[PDB]
């Protein structure tokens, strides 16, 4: 079985959980504040950060490297120009680094440092979904928030270097399955995109409560 199925399939019902977050109902409902969107970009900000310093740590390690897609994919420079547009010219020392948001970025340096066999698991559960569903939270957001077609604070949902993302899904999907796969890498790597999925499940309730 093809890694790329295995995750979609590791991951089906613990992505239903994520979407009914209460945080993410909310959302979807067009019910988000710019204080509840703030806070979830700069959390995101920080995840993206570590995930891409762990990228470029590994980039030829060739249990990464067939997924080492910068220009296409990476969100870092994205989220700083997002930062800049919600919270000003001094947004590093106005964003939240909140606890499940440094609990993240504790495990992407773990993985990345220690075991970067399981990195393509954040990158999936991360890039994956924002290629596929963060296009609709995108149109969401936009609607909920006043936010111009010109895409202003909202770069991370945009992908200037990518035509069309459902070919590109389809490509990364296929070089995803071209990595050296043996069922001791593939188990724990559908274990790890779960935990990714927790990661962010756990983000999304502290952001909520914080809000409340
Ligand atoms: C309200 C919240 C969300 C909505 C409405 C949403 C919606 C979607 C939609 C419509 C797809 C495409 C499904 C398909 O192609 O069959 C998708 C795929 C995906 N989503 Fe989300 N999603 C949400 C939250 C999340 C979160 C929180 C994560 C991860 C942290 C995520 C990760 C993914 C991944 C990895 C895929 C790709 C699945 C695959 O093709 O293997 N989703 N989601």
Redesign the pocket.
Same mark, same amino acid.
Request: charge should be positive; charged fraction near 20%.
């Given at each position: 079985q093809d890694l790329?199925e295995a &995750?979609?399939e590791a991951?089906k019902e613990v992505?239903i959980r994520?979407?009914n977050s209460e945080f993410?109902?909310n959302?979807?409902k067009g019910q988000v504040s710019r204080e509840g969107f703030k806070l979830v970009m700069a959390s995101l900000y920080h995840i993206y950060t570590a995930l891409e310093e762990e990228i470029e740590r590994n980039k030829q390690n060739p249990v990464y490297a067939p997924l080492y897609f910068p220009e296409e994919l990476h969100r870092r420079a994205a989220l700083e120009q997002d930062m800049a547009f919600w919270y000003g010219p001094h947004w590093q020392e106005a964003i939240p680094y909140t606890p499940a948001t440094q609990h993240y970025v504790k495990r992407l340096h773990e993985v990345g440092g220690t075991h970067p066999e399981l990195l393509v698991a954040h990158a999936?559960?991360?890039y &994956?979904?924002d290629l596929?569903?963060?296009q609709? &939270?995108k149109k969401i957001a936009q609607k909920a928030m006043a936010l111009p077609s010109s895409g202003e604070g909202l770069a991370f949902f945009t992908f200037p270097s990518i035509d069309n993302p459902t070919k590109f899904?389809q490509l990364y999907?296929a070089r995803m399955n071209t990595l050296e796969m043996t069922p001791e890498v593939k188990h724990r790597v559908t274990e790890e995109a779960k935990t990714?999925?927790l990661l962010?499940?756990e983000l999304?309730e502290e952001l909520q409560a914080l809000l409340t």
């Open positions: 790329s &995750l979609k991951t992505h994520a979407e993410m109902r959302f979807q999936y559960t991360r &994956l979904g596929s569903g963060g609709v &939270l899904k999907r990714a999925f962010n499940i999304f």
